[PDB]
Amino acid sequence: MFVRVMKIAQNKKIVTVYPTTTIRKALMTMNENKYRRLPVVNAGNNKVVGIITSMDIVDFMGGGSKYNLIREKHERNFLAAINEPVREIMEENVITLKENADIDEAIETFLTKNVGGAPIVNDENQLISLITERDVIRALLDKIDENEVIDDYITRDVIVATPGERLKDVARTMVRNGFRRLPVVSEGRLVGIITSTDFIKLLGSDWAFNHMQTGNVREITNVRMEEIMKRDVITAKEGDKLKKIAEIMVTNDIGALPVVDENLRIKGIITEKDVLKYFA
Ligand SMILES: Nc1ncnc2c1ncn2[C@@H]1O[C@H](COP(=O)(O)OP(=O)(O)OP(=O)(O)O)[C@@H](O)[C@H]1O
Numbered sequence: 001m002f003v004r005v006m007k008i009a010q011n012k013k014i015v016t017v018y019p020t021t022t023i024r025k026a027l028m029t030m031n032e033n034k035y036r037r038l039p040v041v042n043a044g045n046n047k048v049v050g051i052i053t054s055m056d057i058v059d060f061m062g063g064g065s066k067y068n069l070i071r072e073k074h075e076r077n078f079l080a081a082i083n084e085p086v087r088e089i090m091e092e093n094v095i096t097l098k099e100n101a102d103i104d105e106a107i108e109t110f111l112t113k114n115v116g117g118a119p120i121v122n123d124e125n126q127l128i129s130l131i132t133e134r135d136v137i138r139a140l141l142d143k144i145d146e147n148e149v150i151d152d153y154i155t156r157d158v159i160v161a162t163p164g165e166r167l168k169d170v171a172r173t174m175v176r177n178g179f180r181r182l183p184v185v186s187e188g189r190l191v192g193i194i195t196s197t198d199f200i201k202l203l204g205s206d207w208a209f210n211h212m213q214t215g216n217v218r219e220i221t222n223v224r225m226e227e228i229m230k231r232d233v234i235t236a237k238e239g240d241k242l243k244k245i246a247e248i249m250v251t252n253d254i255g256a257l258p259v260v261d262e263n264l265r266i267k268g269i270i271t272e273k274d275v276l277k278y279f280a
């Protein structure tokens with residue numbers, strides 16, 4: 001079937017920033033709009049020139065190569081570094097869809113190009129809209145066979161964080177593996193979840209505005225997972241229906257559920273991208 005992606009796209013206007021928008025302001029925008037994904041456009045002609053997600057912020061904070069903007073150019077000063085324009089840490093060469101793109105293209109793009117959301121552009125590459133894996137799952141939820149089970153879709157080998165792990169280390173794990181969410185596991189048992197969004201929430205805390213002005217930047221990246229993880233996790237289990245799990249994700253704006261034992265031992269993880277393999 002050939003259904004236009006545009007027929008689904010968030011008919012809300014898309015929140016954007018500009019290349020000269022500071023990292024600080026981009027962070028606030030992410031925070032204020034709850035949107036953890038921001039297209040970078042010209043002011044301008046509205047051409048998509050970049051994209052910045054919470055994962056890019058986690059990179060910048062210590063998880064990857066973008067951290068050297070802080071450590072090197074700005075000699076460990078997180079607060080001066082965030083005055084840098086967003087173009088310094090945004091991803092360029094963006095994966096986009098043409099305004100005539102269809103659902104199957106979007107899905108293939110999500111499944112093969114390891115993205116969860118893509119800007120929809122026209123022929124001038126001006127921003128029209130954006131589509132996420134959630135929008136597609138929401139639109140096709142009642143087209144999932146009610147009997148289809150989650151087993152085949154579960155990612156068995158889970159990359160994990162522990163309650164004692166420092167933020168600077170979990171950030172490495174997230175960025176290196178390209179996983180925004182890590183189940184938190186201790187002695188084989190699920191004790192929580194931590195995501196890249198949590199790291200962003202932390203930066204906009206009173207606790208963090210304190211250490212920055214009178215910090216002690218390092219104390220932010222030294223926080224252990226137990227201090228900030230979500231302890232009570234929406235989990236899935238083998239034998240659960242795929243449609244049930246999918247519905248739970250979409251109705252809660254949650255992208256990932258750790259898959260657990262009745263004893264809370266980790267069997268796997270299932271995410272929105274996995275759900276979309278049903279329509280592969
Ligand atoms: N459409 C895109 N085109 C190019 N790069 C992108 C795009 N979307 C995200 N990225 C980049 O991918 C890297 C990982 O970010 P993130 O994991 O937040 O995106 P994602 O993989 O699309 O999200 P999700 O885990 O919900 O599927 C970041 O550097 C981000 O800038």
Ligand SMILES: Nc1ncnc2c1ncn2[C@@H]1O[C@H](COP(=O)(O)OP(=O)(O)OP(=O)(O)O)[C@@H](O)[C@H]1O
Nearest residue numbers: 036193195197198230232233234253254255256257
């Ligand atoms: N399975 C879960 N159970 C309980 N809490 C969760 C679960 N998954 C994520 N969270 C919490 O939800 C909050 C938002 O997480 P996150 O933004 O990474 O979810 P998401 O799938 O990316 O949805 P979105 O991309 O639309 O924001 C975080 O505080 C995270 O700890």
Ligand SMILES: Nc1ncnc2c1ncn2[C@@H]1O[C@H](COP(=O)(O)OP(=O)(O)O)[C@@H](O)[C@H]1O
Nearest residue numbers: 155157158159178179180181182269270271273
């Ligand atoms: N923590 C993890 N450990 C192992 N695999 C994971 C983890 N998180 C996600 N995956 C798998 O990686 C693939 C891409 O999923 P994705 O939704 O982009 O991950 P995430 O939401 O954490 O960024 C999926 O098959 C998913 O099950």
Ligand SMILES: Nc1ncnc2c1ncn2[C@@H]1O[C@H](COP(=O)(O)O)[C@@H](O)[C@H]1O
Nearest residue numbers: 065066067068069070072073074088089
């Ligand atoms: N955008 C960036 N991302 C990562 N590291 C950077 C970035 N900008 C500057 N740096 C680091 O800061 C050092 C000095 O930068 P510069 O003074 O602008 O030439 C560089 O050698 C890099 O190691």
